[PDB]
Structures are given as C-alpha cells and as structure tokens.
Coordinates of all heavy atoms in Angstrom, one line a residue:
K52 N 49.6 -1.9 13.4 CA 50.5 -2.3 14.5 C 50.2 -3.7 15.0 O 51.0 -4.6 15.1 CB 50.8 -1.3 15.6 CG 51.4 0.0 15.2 CD 51.6 0.8 16.6 CE 51.7 2.2 16.4 NZ 52.0 3.0 17.6
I53 N 48.8 -3.8 15.3 CA 48.4 -5.1 15.9 C 48.3 -6.1 14.8 O 48.5 -7.2 15.1 CB 46.9 -4.7 16.7 CG1 47.1 -4.1 17.8 CG2 46.2 -6.1 16.8 CD1 45.8 -3.6 18.5
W54 N 48.0 -5.8 13.5 CA 47.9 -6.8 12.5 C 49.3 -7.5 12.3 O 49.2 -8.7 12.0 CB 47.4 -6.0 11.3 CG 47.4 -6.9 10.1 CD1 48.2 -6.7 8.9 CD2 46.5 -8.1 9.9 NE1 47.9 -7.8 8.0 CE2 46.8 -8.5 8.6 CE3 45.6 -8.7 10.5 CZ2 46.3 -9.7 7.9 CZ3 44.9 -9.9 9.9 CH2 45.4 -10.3 8.6
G55 N 50.4 -6.8 12.3 CA 51.7 -7.3 12.4 C 51.8 -8.6 13.2 O 52.5 -9.4 12.9
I56 N 51.0 -8.6 14.3 CA 50.9 -9.8 15.1 C 49.9 -10.8 14.6 O 50.1 -12.0 14.5 CB 50.7 -9.5 16.7 CG1 51.8 -8.8 17.2 CG2 50.4 -10.8 17.5 CD1 51.5 -8.3 18.7
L57 N 48.7 -10.4 14.2 CA 47.6 -11.2 13.9 C 47.8 -12.0 12.6 O 47.4 -13.0 12.5 CB 46.3 -10.5 14.0 CG 46.0 -9.8 15.4 CD1 44.6 -9.0 15.4 CD2 46.2 -10.8 16.5
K58 N 48.5 -11.3 11.6 CA 48.6 -11.9 10.4 C 49.7 -13.0 10.3 O 49.7 -13.7 9.3 CB 49.3 -10.7 9.4 CG 50.6 -10.4 9.6 CD 51.0 -9.3 8.7 CE 52.4 -8.8 9.0 NZ 52.6 -7.6 8.2
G59 N 50.3 -13.2 11.4 CA 51.2 -14.5 11.5 C 50.7 -15.5 12.4 O 51.5 -16.3 12.9
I60 N 49.4 -15.6 12.5 CA 48.7 -16.7 13.4 C 48.1 -17.7 12.4 O 47.4 -17.5 11.7 CB 47.6 -15.9 14.3 CG1 48.3 -15.0 15.3 CG2 46.8 -17.0 15.0 CD1 47.3 -14.1 15.9
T61 N 48.6 -18.9 12.7 CA 48.2 -20.0 11.9 C 47.5 -21.2 12.7 O 46.6 -21.7 12.0 CB 49.5 -20.6 11.3 OG1 50.3 -21.2 12.3 CG2 50.4 -19.6 10.5
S62 N 47.9 -21.4 14.0 CA 47.2 -22.5 14.8 C 45.7 -22.2 14.8 O 45.2 -21.1 15.3 CB 47.9 -22.4 16.2 OG 47.0 -21.7 17.0
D63 N 45.0 -23.3 14.2 CA 43.5 -23.3 14.1 C 42.8 -23.3 15.5 O 41.7 -22.8 15.6 CB 43.1 -24.5 13.5 CG 43.9 -24.9 12.2 OD1 45.0 -24.8 12.2 OD2 43.1 -24.8 11.0
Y64 N 43.6 -23.7 16.5 CA 43.0 -23.5 17.9 C 42.7 -22.1 18.3 O 41.7 -21.6 18.7 CB 44.0 -24.2 18.9 CG 43.5 -24.1 20.3 CD1 42.5 -25.0 20.8 CD2 44.1 -23.1 21.3 CE1 42.0 -24.8 22.2 CE2 43.7 -23.2 22.6 CZ 42.7 -23.9 23.0 OH 42.1 -23.9 24.3
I65 N 43.8 -21.2 18.1 CA 43.5 -19.8 18.3 C 42.7 -19.2 17.4 O 41.8 -18.3 17.7 CB 45.0 -19.1 18.3 CG1 45.9 -19.6 19.4 CG2 44.9 -17.6 18.6 CD1 45.6 -19.5 20.8
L66 N 42.7 -19.6 16.1 CA 41.9 -19.0 15.1 C 40.4 -19.4 15.3 O 39.6 -18.4 14.9 CB 42.4 -19.5 13.7 CG 43.6 -18.7 13.2 CD1 44.1 -19.3 11.9 CD2 43.3 -17.2 13.2
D67 N 40.0 -20.5 15.8 CA 38.7 -20.9 15.9 C 38.0 -20.9 17.3 O 36.8 -20.9 17.3 CB 38.4 -22.3 15.1 CG 38.8 -22.3 13.7 OD1 38.2 -21.4 13.0 OD2 39.6 -23.0 13.2
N68 N 38.9 -21.0 18.3 CA 38.2 -21.0 19.6 C 38.4 -19.6 20.3 O 38.0 -19.6 21.6 CB 38.8 -22.0 20.5 CG 38.6 -23.5 19.9 OD1 39.3 -23.7 19.0 ND2 37.7 -24.1 20.5
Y69 N 38.9 -18.5 19.7 CA 39.0 -17.3 20.3 C 38.5 -16.1 19.4 O 38.3 -16.3 18.2 CB 40.7 -17.1 20.6 CG 41.1 -17.9 21.6 CD1 41.4 -19.2 21.4 CD2 41.3 -17.4 22.9 CE1 41.8 -20.1 22.5 CE2 41.8 -18.2 23.9 CZ 42.1 -19.6 23.7 OH 42.6 -20.4 24.7
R70 N 38.3 -15.1 20.0 CA 38.1 -13.8 19.3 C 39.0 -12.8 20.0 O 39.6 -12.9 20.9 CB 36.5 -13.4 19.5 CG 36.2 -13.1 21.0 CD 34.8 -12.4 21.1 NE 34.7 -11.7 22.4 CZ 34.3 -12.4 23.5 NH1 33.9 -13.7 23.4 NH2 34.2 -11.9 24.7
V71 N 39.1 -11.6 19.3 CA 40.1 -10.6 19.8 C 39.3 -9.1 19.9 O 38.5 -8.9 19.1 CB 41.2 -10.4 18.8 CG1 42.1 -11.6 18.8 CG2 40.8 -10.1 17.4
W72 N 39.9 -8.4 21.0 CA 39.4 -7.1 21.1 C 40.6 -6.3 21.5 O 41.6 -6.7 22.2 CB 38.2 -6.9 22.1 CG 38.4 -7.4 23.4 CD1 38.4 -8.8 24.0 CD2 38.6 -6.6 24.7 NE1 38.7 -8.8 25.3 CE2 38.8 -7.5 25.8 CE3 38.7 -5.3 25.0 CZ2 39.0 -7.1 27.1 CZ3 39.0 -4.8 26.3 CH2 39.1 -5.8 27.3
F73 N 40.6 -5.0 21.3 CA 41.7 -4.2 21.4 C 41.5 -2.9 22.4 O 40.4 -2.2 22.2 CB 42.1 -3.6 20.0 CG 41.9 -4.7 18.9 CD1 41.0 -4.2 17.9 CD2 42.5 -5.9 18.9 CE1 40.7 -5.2 16.9 CE2 42.2 -6.8 17.9 CZ 41.3 -6.4 16.9
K74 N 42.5 -2.7 23.2 CA 42.3 -1.5 24.1 C 43.5 -0.6 24.0 O 44.6 -1.0 23.9 CB 42.0 -1.9 25.6 CG 41.7 -0.7 26.4 CD 41.9 -1.0 27.9 CE 41.7 0.3 28.6 NZ 42.2 0.3 30.0
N75 N 43.2 0.8 23.9 CA 44.3 1.8 24.1 C 44.2 2.4 25.3 O 43.1 2.8 25.9 CB 44.0 2.8 22.9 CG 44.8 4.0 23.0 OD1 44.3 5.1 23.3 ND2 46.2 3.9 22.8
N76 N 45.5 2.6 26.0 CA 45.5 2.9 27.4 C 46.3 4.2 27.6 O 47.3 4.4 26.9 CB 46.3 1.8 28.2 CG 45.7 0.4 27.8 OD1 44.9 -0.2 28.6 ND2 46.0 -0.2 26.7
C77 N 45.9 4.9 28.6 CA 46.6 6.3 29.1 C 47.1 6.1 30.5 O 46.4 6.1 31.4 CB 45.6 7.4 29.0 SG 46.2 9.1 29.3
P78 N 48.5 5.7 30.5 CA 48.9 5.2 32.0 C 49.2 6.2 33.0 O 49.9 6.0 33.9 CB 50.4 4.7 31.5 CG 50.5 4.6 30.0 CD 49.4 5.6 29.6
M79 N 48.6 7.5 32.8 CA 48.6 8.5 33.8 C 50.1 9.1 33.9 O 50.1 10.3 34.3 CB 48.1 7.9 35.3 CG 46.7 7.2 35.2 SD 45.9 7.0 36.7 CE 46.9 5.9 37.6
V80 N 51.0 8.3 33.7 CA 52.3 8.8 33.3 C 52.9 8.0 32.1 O 52.9 6.9 32.2 CB 53.2 8.9 34.5 CG1 53.7 7.4 35.0 CG2 54.5 9.7 34.1
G81 N 53.3 8.8 31.0 CA 53.9 8.1 30.0 C 53.0 8.1 28.7 O 51.9 8.5 28.9
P82 N 53.4 7.7 27.6 CA 52.7 7.7 26.5 C 51.5 6.5 26.3 O 51.6 5.7 27.0 CB 53.7 7.5 25.3 CG 54.7 6.5 25.8 CD 54.8 7.2 27.3
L83 N 50.6 6.8 25.3 CA 49.6 5.8 25.2 C 50.1 4.5 24.6 O 51.1 4.5 23.9 CB 48.6 6.4 24.2 CG 48.0 7.8 24.4 CD1 46.8 8.0 23.5 CD2 47.6 7.9 25.9
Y84 N 49.6 3.4 25.0 CA 50.0 2.1 24.6 C 48.7 1.2 24.2 O 47.8 1.4 25.0 CB 50.9 1.3 25.5 CG 50.3 0.7 26.8 CD1 49.8 -0.6 26.7 CD2 50.1 1.3 28.0 CE1 49.2 -1.3 27.8 CE2 49.5 0.6 29.0 CZ 49.0 -0.6 28.9 OH 48.5 -1.3 30.0

C-alpha cells in the first residue's frame, strides 16, 4: 500500500535528502491505519 506512493517518487531532492519510516496506528476507536 505504501509502495504505491513511493514508487512514483522522482524528484532527486526527496530521493537523496530524505529517508522513510512507517508506523501503524490503533486510534482507540476505529480501524488500524
């Protein structure tokens, strides 16, 4: 699901000056996001 976003990233600024981490959340009410 996340890769559908990351696979369309072309700008070398984002690609070379950033790193990514991912979090899964339990909002106390509602489904995980």
Side-chain angles (χ1 to χ4, degrees):
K52 293 183 197 182
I53 287 176
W54 171 248
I56 295 181
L57 303 184
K58 78 180 171 188
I60 292 167
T61 68
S62 90
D63 312 57
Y64 179 73
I65 302 294
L66 279 178
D67 295 306
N68 298 77
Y69 289 80
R70 66 167 194 276
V71 292
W72 57 285
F73 329 116
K74 190 200 173 195
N75 169 252
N76 313 261
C77 189
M79 311 197 297
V80 67
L83 309 190
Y84 80 90

